């Protein structure tokens, strides 16, 4: 599996929920990001595919006030904007 490299801001985000390395598989990046969103309770209690990130670092990194977990292609685009090319 291909190893990818987070930029400094994303890296600090992943290391806040136990991540220990400088490079990751994409399944690992998606693991730590999910643990972040769910630990901080950013998902809507009632409509659990929708994430509110307006007052969070994640909103600054992704450039949105919210997104939907159904939009797979859009989540991948937003993650790849935050990886070293």
């Amino acid at each position: 599996e291909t190893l990818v490299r987070p930029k400094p801001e994303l890296l600090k985000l992943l290391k806040s929920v136990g991540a220990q390395k400088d490079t990751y598989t994409m399944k690992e990046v998606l693991f730590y990001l999910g643990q972040y969103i769910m630990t901080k309770r950013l998902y809507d209690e009632k409509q659990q595919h929708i994430v509110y990130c307006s007052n969070d670092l994640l909103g600054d990194l992704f450039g949105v006030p919210s997104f939907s977990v159904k939009e797979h292609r859009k989540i991948y685009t937003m993650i790849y904007r935050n990886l070293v090319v």
Partner: peptide
């Protein structure tokens, strides 16, 4: 679904 079940669907695309 639960947040966990929607989020699992992304693992698939990886």
């Amino acid at each position: 679904l639960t947040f966990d079940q929607y989020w699992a669907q992304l693992d698939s695309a990886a």
